[PDB]
Amino acid sequence: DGPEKNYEKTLAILQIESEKAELRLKEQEVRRLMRARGDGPWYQFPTPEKEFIDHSPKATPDN
Amino acid sequence: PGIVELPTLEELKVEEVKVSSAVLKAAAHHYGAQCDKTNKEFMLCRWEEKDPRRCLK
C-alpha cells in the first residue's frame, strides 16, 4: 500500500495508547481520592436505614 | 458542654393531692370525664415538647 498508511496507523495506535495511559492514571487518582474521602458514587459504605425507625407517639413522652 | 437549665423549688412548689390510689381509682372515670381538657393540654404539650420543664404551668 505505501508508507503513509503505516505512518498514520502508527499515529492512531499511539493516540489510543496515550489516551489509555492518561485515563488509567486519572482513574488511579480518582479511586485514591474517593477512598480517602468518600463523597461520590464509589466507596459508599453502608448506613442503617431511616425507614425502619418508629416515629409514632410512644408510651414515654420523653423520646 | 453547656450548663443544664432546670427550675427551682419555688417554681416546682405547688400543693398537691394527698389522695390515695384507691381514692383516685374510685374517682378515676369522672376525673377523666370532667377534667379532660386540662389533662389533654398537658399530655399534648408533653408529647410535643419533650422537655418536662416546658409544661410546669
Cell numbers for A35: 477512598
The 10 Å Cβ neighbour count of residue A33 is 13
Among the listed residues A19, A43, A21, A20, the one whose alpha carbon sits nearest the alpha carbon of residue A30: A43
The nearest CA of chain B is from the CA of A56 a distance in Å of 11
| Alpha carbons B22 and B40: distance in angstroms, whole number | 23
Cross-chain residue pair B46–A61, CB shorter than 8 Å? yes
Residues 13-52 of B with CB under 8 A from A: 43, 46-47, 50, 52
Cell numbers for B45: 404539650
| Alpha carbons A27 and A12: distance in angstroms, whole number | 22
Question: What does the DSSP assignment read for B19-43?
Answer: --HHHHHHTHHHHHHHSHHHHHHHH
Among the listed residues B32, B38, B35, the one whose alpha carbon sits nearest the alpha carbon of residue B55: B38
Cα separations (Å) of B22 from B18, B19, B26, B30? 12, 8, 6, 14
Residue A17 identity (one-letter amino acid) = E
List CB contacts (< 8 A) between B46 and chain A.
61
Specify the experimental method: cryo-EM
